[PDB]
């Protein structure tokens, strides 16, 4: 019901100007929030900020004065200009669309790459993910844990999963509710600043990388991630 599509330059000069394009197509809309999020090489989620169906606009404070995201309604384009760029700012982009209405969906872009050839101030909750990497043998039981250095709302706790060459996709929103398309042998619980997510039974197509994440507090963060693979060569 709504696809975006990001585009624009593949590499950009040190102190140069970053500019995106956000194409959104399918259904109407009449609330929400398009946000830009970007994954560093690495594979870290870095939350850049966000235009609302009203125009309203929250910019990551490390990215405060150097950034802006504005829409262009006529022609249903939502837009990220970044100034001064980087190398630190090498990495793929992603456009995506949320209904604070509707907790239980998020749809995002495809994502875009884009290399390089802090005024602000704030604070942010850290998630910490441990291990980074793990492995396990298909029929086991998984548990994946992810802290956060200050208490956030478990309605406001969520957890994606991403596989090589695709954008992360929403996997359990508020803590325990299963997204759609997620099997239901996955599971999650957790309160305070302390979350898991629990596979009953390791299945081959369960390998991938999963990322918590907490829109609690802003500016909203994503945990370093767990990668989790299969054994048996
Ligand atoms: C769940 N992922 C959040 C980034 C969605 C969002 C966007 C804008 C404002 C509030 C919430």
């Known amino acids: 019901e709504v696809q975006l599509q990001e585009s624009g330059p593949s590499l950009v000069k040190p102190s140069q100007t970053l500019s995106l394009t956000c194409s959104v197509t399918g259904d109407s809309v009449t609330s929400g929030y398009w946000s830009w999020i970007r994954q560093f090489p690495g594979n870290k989620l870095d939350y850049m900020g966000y235009?609302?169906?009203?125009?309203?606009?929250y910019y990551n404070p490390s990215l405060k004065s150097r950034i802006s995201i504005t829409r262009d309604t006529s022609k249903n384009q939502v837009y990220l200009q970044l100034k001064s760029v980087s190398s630190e700012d090498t990495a793929t982009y992603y456009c995506?669309?949320?209904?604070?209405?509707?907790?239980?969906?998020?749809?995002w872009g495809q994502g875009t790459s884009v290399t390089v050839s802090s005024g602000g101030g704030g604070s942010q909750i850290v998630l910490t993910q441990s291990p980074a990497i793990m492995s396990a043998s298909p029929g086991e039981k998984v548990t994946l844990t992810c802290s956060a250095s200050?208490?956030?709302?478990?309605?406001?706790l969520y957890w994606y999963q991403q596989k090589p060459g695709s954008s992360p996709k929403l996997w359990i929103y508020?803590?325990?509710n299963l997204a759609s398309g997620v099997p239901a042998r996955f599971s999650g619980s957790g309160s305070g600043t302390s979350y898991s997510l629990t596979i009953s039974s390791m299945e081959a197509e369960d390998a991938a990388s999963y990322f918590c994440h907490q829109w609690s507090s802003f500016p909203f963060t994503f945990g370093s991630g767990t990668k989790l693979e299969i054994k048996r060569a």
């Open positions: 200050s208490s956030v709302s478990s309605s406001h």
């Open positions: 235009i609302s169906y009203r125009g309203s606009t």
């Open positions: 995506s669309y949320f209904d604070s209405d509707d907790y239980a969906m998020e749809y």
């Open positions: 508020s803590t325990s």
